[PDB]
């Protein structure tokens, strides 16, 4: 799997690491005691929707129709 | 269920007993409701008072310092004092060794030395203390005199003389606020209605916007 | 969010150093004088002060605890009570309060 | 002010507020620790805070105010009685100025106008 | 913090989300050399407030005590 | 002592100087006096509403009766 | 609750704070006849699915199969 | 789009959510791993995603795309390549339509008019 | 807040049976038809419609087709192309919507 794209963000456990992604190639992996990375090694950012309830969707229909 | 004791009283709780059946009684409940809109109009028709009367403005300047309360440790000088007097009983109870015993010459000879640095420190501590909260206890009463002489003409001003007029006429009003049926009815208190509303155009304008008008020193609750 | 999350206005420099976290310096700080010589400066001020400002310093002490009332009606009944009766703006100007 | 002998306990609980705190009706299994006798009407019971009232007048009657009202019965009513006015006048007049910090009310969630839904 | 009006959820510090733990310190000489516990007696009045009575020494002699 | 007009600076200081916390207390104030000011108006019209049965009375109609 | 937008202060489910728990049953047969826990493999899909392939029979009938 | 080839940091970081992504700068670091002989110019270096852009070249050039293109050195600098603007571009919508999200936006907490303030 | 808090819009009724709590009923629940009484009444409409309603359907489902598109120019475009050359207001007095 590729190298995850870099990501700064990152949570401490005992000491602070002061990590940066862009000092080595490939990212250390995580100990217990020492990281936790952020969350999505192999994310983007998109613009999601949620999908309004279908009887709510009807009753929208009907009042367009009736408009029209 | 706020004004607990006016709705109580306009009931006549305090001098009947309501009536047994839910009906009437329901209905006499419903029938204050005009009278708490009045009483509660009234209360919030009282005139301003200066506000540097009873109480020093807390955000002058001179209380800047920040000054802290001086204190006596009573239970501190009491410890170390018992701990002091634990040291006593220990070459009390060790005298013959402390006093005989060559090996221990250095614990006879300073150990008063040390006592005497111990209980210095002790007293040291209580005798400071002791002095700064009688320069605290002294300032607060001789700088209190100087601001009640320096504040004493504010209750000269005529507000004071408006504040209380406005409560005697208040007085007199709500005493003769009165039940005039027991219809259980908003009818009950016909006549009051009209007293109360001549307090309140007294007071007032209601020809106006906004009869009761906001300023900072005003009544809300 | 984050609960050690701040939110800062003016610039930070932070250490680069392992096992620590902490600002090490302010960008462009300057020094000023020392605790010494701003004692200095103001014992200078204190020593006229006390020397060449106390005379006709009850009147202006009276203007000032005047105008630390709450309303105006009752700051010009302190000046017309207390100060001799004097004048609102006329008092103002004196304590610099006027543009 | 309350114009009945009850209300929905839910329309005094906070909706955007942890509810800590309920108005509960007068506990009328208090008027059975009073061991001396009295009379009272069923009438009188459930209008708020006027129970422990009318409890506290019976004791100050039966008893005085010095090392005879200190019992237990009759201090859980004096104790009770000002307690009820102390938070019915602040639940009063949080329900005078605050009125959308309740649930019922139409301002907790105000619900929209169809001009802004852009349909 | 309860008290301060913030409800709390679990309990411990091992936060599960996105948080910045602070495990105890490594009772190892090498962590205990560069660390040290806050000591909360060190946390004091400031010593200005000595300098408030200067009122009180001008008191008195404006008094004559 | 200056007016209004001549306190755009004093004004300033209060926008540069209070955190925005302070900022946000002292909006939220004006809008709950607004808001209480509307209340104790809508208190005042109800209350100082002629109901039916007092048409035409006025304080001369009041008996001469206390709340005894 | 962490991916679905709920950051996640502490751990576990003992509430700190005005919340209710809940501790899981006590082993004794007294709890163990009252409550039994929930198994995943009775919540099932609604058997009103199986009507959807009424629209299948009807177009293979329609297409002469 | 930014018009420059650096770009503050927090300017891309929420205010009111948790920051859980950053847009770091060029890794520089991974145009060392190339094993073959390349020109580059350190002009080029620092617009954001255009030095993955310029590996991912050189390495198709050296290299096609089958069998030999598959090695770590190249596939981290394709991959980067087109994480980095797809990332850009979701952060350059939110930076167009979404200005109130970041950092030293005056609209993510506004200050109010000196007229809010009743005095 | 507490996690389990539900605000609901219609009244129900709690069980006060100890170790337990659920609702035990609704406040004014009317029980309808039976699942075989709602069947045989369900038969009888869908009889009818397989009887006496397939005559002349093509027209109206290729009216009610159209009507499904997002703009009213599409729908006219529908009506003139699939349902030959259909009127919009007229269509629409056949299929129930218009008031
Ligand atoms: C879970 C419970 C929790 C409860 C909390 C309490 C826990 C219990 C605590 C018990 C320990 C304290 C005991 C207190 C008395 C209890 C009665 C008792 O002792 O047991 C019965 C005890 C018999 O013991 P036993 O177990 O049956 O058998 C003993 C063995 O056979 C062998 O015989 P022995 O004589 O060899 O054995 C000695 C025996 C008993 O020996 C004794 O005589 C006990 C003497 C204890 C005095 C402790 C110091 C007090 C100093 C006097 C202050 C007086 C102030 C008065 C002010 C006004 C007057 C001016 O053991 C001790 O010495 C116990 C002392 C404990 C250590 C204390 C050292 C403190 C130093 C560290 C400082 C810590 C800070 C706290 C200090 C608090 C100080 C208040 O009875 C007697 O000893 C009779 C004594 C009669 C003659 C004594 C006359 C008075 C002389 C006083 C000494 C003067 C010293 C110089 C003056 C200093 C100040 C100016």
Not at chain 2, 79 to 107: D, E, P, V
Not at chain 3, 46 to 66: D, F, P, V
């Amino acid at each position: 799997a590729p190298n995850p794209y870099p990501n700064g963000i990152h949570f401490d456990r005992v000491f602070p690491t002061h990590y940066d992604p862009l000092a080595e190639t490939n990212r250390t992996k995580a100990n217990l005691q020492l990281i936790k990375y952020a969350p999505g090694n192999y994310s983007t950012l998109v613009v999601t929707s949620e999908k309004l309830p279908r009887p709510c969707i009807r009753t929208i229909q009907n009042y367009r129709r009736c408009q029209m | 269920m706020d004004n607990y004791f006016t709705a109580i009283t306009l009931l006549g709780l305090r001098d009947q007993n309501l009536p047994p059946f839910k009906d009437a009684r329901l209905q006499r409940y419903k029938s204050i409701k005009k009278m708490i809109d009045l009483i509660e109009t009234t209360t919030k028709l009282a005139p301003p008072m200066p506000v540097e009367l009873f109480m020093l403005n807390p955000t002058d300047p001179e209380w800047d310092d920040d000054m802290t309360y001086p204190t006596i440790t009573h239970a501190t000088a009491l410890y170390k004092s018992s701990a002091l007097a634990g040291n006593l009983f220990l070459y009390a109870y060790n005298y013959n060794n402390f006093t005989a015993n060559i090996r221990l010459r250095t614990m006879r000879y300073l150990f008063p030395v040390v006592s005497l640095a111990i209980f210095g420190n002790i007293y040291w501590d209580y005798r400071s203390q002791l002095v700064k909260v009688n320069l605290f206890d002294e300032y607060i009463q001789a700088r209190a005199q100087e601001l009640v002489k320096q504040n004493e003409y504010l209750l000269e001003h005529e507000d004071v003389k408006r504040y209380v007029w406005w409560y005697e006429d208040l007085k007199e009003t709500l005493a003769r606020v009165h039940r005039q049926a027991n219809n259980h009815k908003a009818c009950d208190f016909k006549d009051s209605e009209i007293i109360l509303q001549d307090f309140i155009r007294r007071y007032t304008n209601p020809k106006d916007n906004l009869p009761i008008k906001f300023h900072p020193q005003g009544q809300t609750f | 969010m984050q609960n050690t999350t701040n939110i800062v206005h003016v610039p930070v420099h932070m250490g680069h150093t392992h096992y620590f976290d902490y600002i090490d310096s302010f960008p462009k700080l300057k020094e000023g004088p020392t605790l010494e010589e701003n004692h200095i400066t103001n014992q200078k001020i204190l020593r006229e002060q006390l020397i060449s400002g106390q005379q006709g310093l009850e009147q202006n002490l009276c203007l000032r605890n005047c105008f630390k009332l709450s309303q105006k009606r009752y700051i010009e009944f302190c000046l017309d009570r207390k100060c001799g009766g004097a004048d609102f703006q006329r008092a103002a100007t004196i304590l610099g309060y006027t543009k | 002010t309350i114009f009945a002998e009850t209300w929905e306990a839910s329309e005094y609980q906070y909706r955007n507020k942890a509810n800590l705190k309920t108005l509960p009706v007068n506990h009328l299994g208090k008027l059975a620790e009073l061991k001396f006798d009295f009379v009272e009407y069923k009438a009188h019971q459930l209008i708020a805070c006027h129970l422990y009232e009318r409890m506290t007048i019976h004791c100050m009657n039966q008893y005085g105010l010095f090392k005879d009202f200190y019992r237990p019965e009759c201090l859980d009513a004096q104790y009770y009685f000002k307690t009820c006015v102390e938070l019915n006048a602040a639940y009063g007049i949080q329900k005078k100025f605050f009125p959308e910090h309740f649930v019922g009310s139409p301002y907790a969630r105000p619900v929209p106008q169809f001009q802004q839904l852009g349909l | 913090t309860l008290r301060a009006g913030k409800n709390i959820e679990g309990s411990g510090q091992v936060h599960f989300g996105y948080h910045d733990q602070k495990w105890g310190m490594p009772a190892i000489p090498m962590f205990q050399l560069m660390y040290y516990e806050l000591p909360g007696n060190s946390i004091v009045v400031n010593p200005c407030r000595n300098q408030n009575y200067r009122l009180y020494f001008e008191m008195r002699k404006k008094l004559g005590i | 002592v200056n007016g209004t007009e001549k306190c755009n600076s004093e004004a300033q200081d209060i926008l540069a100087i209070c955190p925005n916390w302070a900022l946000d207390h002292m909006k939220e104030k004006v809008r709950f006096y607004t808001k209480a000011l509307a209340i104790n108006n809508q208190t005042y019209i109800r209350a100082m509403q002629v109901e039916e049965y007092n048409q035409g009375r006025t304080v001369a109609d009041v008996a001469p009766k206390t709340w005894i």
